[PDB]
Amino acid sequence: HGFLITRHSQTTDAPQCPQGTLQVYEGFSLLYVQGNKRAHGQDLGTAGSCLRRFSTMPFMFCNINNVCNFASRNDYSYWLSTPEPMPMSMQPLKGQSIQPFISRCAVCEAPAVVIAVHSQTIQIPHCPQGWDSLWIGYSFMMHTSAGAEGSGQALASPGSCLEEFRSAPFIECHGRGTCNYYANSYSFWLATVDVSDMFSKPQSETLKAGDLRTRISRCQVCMKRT
Amino acid sequence: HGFLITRHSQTTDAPQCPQGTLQVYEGFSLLYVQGNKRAHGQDLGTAGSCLRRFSTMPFMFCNINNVCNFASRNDYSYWLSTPEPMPMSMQPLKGQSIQPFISRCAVCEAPAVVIAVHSQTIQIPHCPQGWDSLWIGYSFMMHTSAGAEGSGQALASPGSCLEEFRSAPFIECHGRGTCNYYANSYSFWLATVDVSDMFSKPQSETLKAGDLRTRISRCQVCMKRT
Amino acid sequence: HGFLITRHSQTTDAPQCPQGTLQVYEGFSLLYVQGNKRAHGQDLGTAGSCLRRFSTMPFMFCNINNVCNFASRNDYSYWLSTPEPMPMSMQPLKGQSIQPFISRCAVCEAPAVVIAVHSQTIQIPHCPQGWDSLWIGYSFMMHTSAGAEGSGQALASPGSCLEEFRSAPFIECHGRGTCNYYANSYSFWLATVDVSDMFSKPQSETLKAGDLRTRISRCQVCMKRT
Amino acid sequence: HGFLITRHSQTTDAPQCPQGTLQVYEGFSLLYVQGNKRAHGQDLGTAGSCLRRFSTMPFMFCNINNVCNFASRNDYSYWLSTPEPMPMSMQPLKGQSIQPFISRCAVCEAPAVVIAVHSQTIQIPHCPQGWDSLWIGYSFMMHTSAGAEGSGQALASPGSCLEEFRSAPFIECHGRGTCNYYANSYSFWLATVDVSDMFSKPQSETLKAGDLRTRISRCQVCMKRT
Amino acid sequence: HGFLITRHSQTTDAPQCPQGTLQVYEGFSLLYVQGNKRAHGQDLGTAGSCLRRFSTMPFMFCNINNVCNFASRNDYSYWLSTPEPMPMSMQPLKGQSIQPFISRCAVCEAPAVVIAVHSQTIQIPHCPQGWDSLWIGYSFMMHTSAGAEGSGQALASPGSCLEEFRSAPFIECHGRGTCNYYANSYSFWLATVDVSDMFSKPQSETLKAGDLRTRISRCQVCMKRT
Amino acid sequence: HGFLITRHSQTTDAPQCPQGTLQVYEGFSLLYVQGNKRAHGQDLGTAGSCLRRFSTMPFMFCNINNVCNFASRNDYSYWLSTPEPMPMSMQPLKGQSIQPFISRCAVCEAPAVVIAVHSQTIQIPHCPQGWDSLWIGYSFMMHTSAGAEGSGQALASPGSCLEEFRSAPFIECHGRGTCNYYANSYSFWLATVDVSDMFSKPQSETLKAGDLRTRISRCQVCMKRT
Ligand SMILES: [Cl-]
Ligand SMILES: [Cl-]
Ligand SMILES: [Cl-]
Ligand SMILES: [Cl-]
Ligand SMILES: [Cl-]
Ligand SMILES: [Cl-]
Ligand SMILES: [Cl-]
Ligand SMILES: [Cl-]
Ligand SMILES: [Cl-]
Ligand SMILES: [Cl-]
Ligand SMILES: [Cl-]
Ligand SMILES: [Cl-]
């Protein structure tokens, strides 16, 4: 049997397929699109989040009168990003200067089902008995950007287990050909919760650089041993 | 092979895994979350809807300047609920008084694929030939609450087949640590339709206590016999 | 093993299940529903997009006070449609005159996993090595209609691979019993991108009848050979 | 000089114009409309909230291809309502049975500017020096219903000063010709605040019948003496 | 005394101020803007709808970290338009080719208050006793476009009384410098209602070229005689 | 005659009423509220934006079953703010520590109509002939925060003319009793446009501290001389 998963490097290099899986293709890490203001995501654990080719506008829309428009309005695409910093000017990137910002991915064929498990603690959870580890990460749940629109990940999916934590894990691109980070680009992570605190008022916390991971749930991606 | 499913008790007791499946873990029935007003759900048939630990705030958000905030705004979580009535005062629940309201779940490993089928009638549908029954229920399609935001279930998924019908099957919780039912918490169910009525104007109906199930589609959850 | 997929005819005839799969049931092509303004879709590759019975109102909602309302507000359903033209008057369709407009579907059991692959070009992509073709099509990503609400397809799913391209692939139906096409019913397709253009400003294009497919990505639906 | 204001009876009888103003016309109390999901209100203090003629569908929409549609989709109108109770069945009202539910209004010409003032207490505020009282009421700020869409009042306007407090001050009507109250129809009132509490954590309260007004700000409508 | 009103030519020529008013300035007819997906309109009867200078991007946004961005995302402006047809290609307009599409306006000082009255019939309503006519028109209530966002007019305001009926009375412009009409650009007009029909099911109608005005309410703009 | 306007100090001191107007009352600068996710603003030029008393929760909501809830969900209020910096920790403010952050206002009675005029340049516009200056400022058009919801100002109103430019002119408060600035709190300002550039592609710009005002339109608030 064959089950297809995606791995995201969060760098300009394609990731290696995990041990016991084989590579199908490599591409660019698509997070979601926004057309006519409506966001639609592709689960990061699935082949849909790995497009063979990048574009700031990877879709087009058609109206009921048989007229289609490509990159001819104000639509968006969103992509997982690399550690590349914003330029000092903080101006949107255009053309070739976009490339260093876009995460790469690989689609891999697994011989069995692949899942994520989440600890809701700072400790990496163990795979269920009979399952083997593929990778470890941080519990990535949802995101919003323009218009507070966005999408999210299935916690059962490898897409909810991002290998590198980033406060700004994705970049916003436009039909007009620009990309940038924006002040309202938010990432939402499964949080830690202590057993004694489950029913208590959550203890509010604002975390700064160096402490961000103290409240982020950890995860492992696991494949059934057959 | 192994395929993971979730069963929800809709009570304060964890459900038993259905015959022919084995238990992986138990948890609390997460329906969806709402961050920066945007709702994101976890399919009730999948492990993502079963969190090991409850919290009124099971996530945190981070901004592009490497500052994260936990339970420090006005965000929500939503959980499948129990038969526990609202207090007479109808005041939000805090602390330990939340526990009796939260549904429990179990994640189970099945040896084969698990599906839901729906009748669009008051009769329970039969499993496809070659599939065996795991449980029966009511066709649960979507829900909305605060800001009319919400999420839904895949009808192909066991998550669309809720074992106990409830007009109010889920409770709303807040980062501030409260939970309650609200007047705008809506549940949407796959409805019945008679064959002769498929193309006709739907006959509008308002149903009261005792008659609610007369227009709710029934379902069965089925596992492929291998 | 068994994995369930859906095929949509986009005609008033049920489609035949592809070679190597067996029929489970036939129905009507449900795209999404909209209740209390919130859209919720059923992935076109899954059994949830194939309802045994059509209705302009295939759901009902319940409030927390144990009162349910069926077809008693202003809610919507959306269905894949046929080549049937709008009447000259462009008035909404009622009753039996709706039937010629609604696409049919079949749910088929496959012996192995079924995926879609997308080329991002005008050429049909090839199935991965070890996978066999079930059908070819056009990369269908998302849609919006009333209130710019909508839903979309998973690119990994057969639901993202529509066999016939249509500018207007779906019709809007109402609880009141009417259906029609509307000026704001938009379809969004995965677009073509040339390798040399990936980082460049997308070349904006408005396409008219005869040229629409020049910028639509192609796809194939593939089943793992076991 | 002449300045036009509206008074709303919240009954099936037109209100009398206040002392020192003269009647222009009488009508029906329009609160807001909702077209293509988007709400648009008419300030209750202005002539726009007083339509000469009632209809469940008082508007029509046109598309860019010179086709207009009247009462041919799923649009709404909202009207201030009377003390008429919901029928026991809680079914939507149709036809002549709608009339007892709709508030009446009168548009009056004032010789000078007319304002509202608000106390943020259970005591009626006094008119500014040089202004005379026209009526007293309760501070009505905003409302939501279908899709959590809605509109509100300007606190400087007489429209923010509703003469009779009602938990359910408005009814929802549809293009299809029905009206009803719905569980998600919310009214928002300017609340009371004690001076010592301005910076403190607000003391959360759930109020039941008999106590609702204990936290509602009071208002007066005032006309400049010339 | 002085009260400022706006008149819109719906042509490339500035309108003349009505008899008994004097010109303050001339400009371009701004309908609304859309920033971070949120629409905000300027009442067409007020000076805010008459900008001295046109731009496809007449605003800029700032974030809390003292960084402002001008025309550097995917934001919109909307302007009342002229009778200029779409080019045959239906491609967005850029640069100088935008000018023929943009309506002009004049801001005029009136010696007294200026109102609109609406008939809800195909007959022009009369001004209230003591008020004189400035112009006649059609009852323009609201509009939506991208993301079904939009804004509307106050029926008490001259802005709700558009002198020329147009199915497509406004054009959409973008920060990137393009303008076009789009399939989802909707105009909403106060409709006609017969007295005998007020409580009846509205008679649904689809109107084509030549018949559009048969269901549009008429209006007059009136100034108090002092 | 009397016309009421509001002036906002953007400091912890009440502003003085401008020359030729007299004080009615002083209060706190309310920008908008957000209930059940829906934003509703009070025009900054009007008395509604000046509340006698501050509260993080200045409203309450009621449901159709005669139950009202005050500060018992996840609702917001937004207030114009002072130059007070965020604490270093960037944690939300509670209790008395909120006071230094909240702008004060005064409501003033003018003997004639008060307007704003806007230059769309870095130069302050002149009052129309026959009008006298009350104050000068910067053209403040709209704002968004939580859920990208927000409201805006009428450009004809003094509320669109803010006396001190601030990148972060408003603070977000919650029913739970906290206030803070958030990464997605955006302010939108009327921008400058050169005459030669009106029809050209807008020249995109990202401005940093020291240069922000280079693209902000200026305004004056003017009162008719009687
Ligand atoms: Cl675009
Ligand atoms: Cl930004
Ligand atoms: Cl929170
Ligand atoms: Cl409630
Ligand atoms: Cl309905
Ligand atoms: Cl239409
Ligand atoms: Cl309608
Ligand atoms: Cl209801
Ligand atoms: Cl822009
Ligand atoms: Cl279009
Ligand atoms: Cl609250
Ligand atoms: Cl933040």
Author numbering:
A (entry chain A), B (entry chain A), C (entry chain A), D (entry chain A), E (entry chain A), F (entry chain A): 4 to 229
Please give sentences taken from the publication describing this entry.
Basement membranes are extracellular structures of epithelia and endothelia that have collagen IV scaffolds of triple α-chain helical protomers that associate end-to-end, forming networks. At the C-termini, interactions occur between the trimeric NC1 domains of two protomers, forming a hexamer of these domains reinforced by sulfilimine cross-links. Recent studies in one of our laboratories revealed that the NC1 domains function as recognition modules, directing the selection and assembly of α-chains into protomers and networks.
In an attempt to visualize the Goodpasture antigens, we tried to crystallize the α345NC1 heterohexamer by using an equimolecular mixture of pure recombinant α3NC1, α4NC1 and α5NC1 domains. Using this approach, while attempting to produce crystals of the α345NC1 heterohexamer that predominates in the BM of the kidney, we solved the three-dimensional structure of the recently reported homohexamer of α5NC1 domains. Size-exclusion chromatography experiments confirmed a strong tendency of α5NC1 to hexamerize: ∼80% of this domain was self-organized as hexamers in solution, while isolated α3NC1 or α4NC1 eluted as monomers. Conversely, our experimental results have shown that equimolecular mixtures of α3NC1, α4NC1 and α5NC1 only produce α5NC1homo crystals. Chloride ions were also present in our α1NC1homo, α3NC1homo and α5NC1homo structures at two different positions in the protomer–protomer interface. Our crystal structures of the α3NC1 and α5NC1 homohexamers provide the first view of the arrangement of the EA and EB regions, which are known critical components of two epitopes that reside in the dissociated α3 and α5 subunits of native α345NC1 hexamers. In the homohexamers these regions are exposed on the surface and are presumably unreactive to antibody binding, as they are in the native α345NC1 hexamers. In Goodpasture’s disease autoantibodies directed to the α3NC1 and α5NC1 domains are generated. In Alport’s syndrome, mutations in these chains, including α5NC1, lead to a defective network assembly, causing the multi-laminar splitting of the glomerular BM.
